[PDB]
Subunit: 62 residues, 6 copies
């Protein structure tokens, strides 16, 4: 088993999440030689007021 | 201090969650000899639209 | 790059979150010779019904 | 499936860790109705020089 | 930006790891519209004696 | 309780880690109204062949 955790800002439409999960899964499965069904993906969506870069929260930089 | 982080799909009823937290604490305290106050449990509940296996998001669950 | 992840209970005012972030970034930046832009902070806010100490979920405490 | 991550200082005896994994799995499996093989445990062992409380690294006692 | 954390058993050859990182980076950048240079990947390689499934540590299962 | 996890490359000297842990514990204890004993810091040190930016692992960037 291999788990891919993607940290990204929330807001992505369902179709985009679905595409991302499908492509990452195919790629990891083949490349690592893991059973397709054994590849897990978790999307950790962060709020803009929970992520900062260069000392500034994205809720403010927005 | 010992921290048990449980990653599971959202949806479990409160009773089951409080029962899980209780059992994990009692076992961890015992087996590792940690004081109850030092045993912390964090429930990382993942949404159905954020949890995938076999390239399929649970929210898309084919069934 | 340096990543700081803060795990804390939900509920802190945006004012304090904003200051914690600026400060943690400054301290981490100078003490580690990392450029400002290369310092990231993520706030993992946990709900009261996902946070437990001593076998008790905070959502189960009165008040 | 369910994943249980245990963050604890390194140094515990192998049998304590084995027992912990076994007990955690049985209990999570039965309690959450998850198949025994679908329960996963990850032991995140932290070094004494990477763990602090009260501003003091445990390596510094 | 976007961070991809891969949790997998330790032991993969350097070439496998660099290809994995390249593939994940191009795909994440492509599908999410994130600058290729901003995509970060961290490999959380777990020891065989820290990874269990079905109540058994991989180190015991394999050895 | 507040937990601060710092992800950084392995290698910083003891004194530097000690100072980092002190300063961070100072700022967090202050702004979040938390007693020292309740501010935990974990240093998640990653090796150069486990961290990548722009599709390049720090290990390959430094050469072989």
């Amino acid at each position: 088993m291999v788990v891919l955790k993607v940290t990204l800002l929330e807001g992505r439409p369902p179709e985009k999440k679905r595409e991302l999960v499908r492509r990452l899964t195919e790629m990891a499965s083949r490349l690592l030689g893991e059973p397709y069904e054994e590849v897990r993906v978790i999307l950790y969506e962060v709020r803009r007021d929970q992520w900062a870069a260069g000392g500034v929260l994205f809720s403010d930089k927005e």
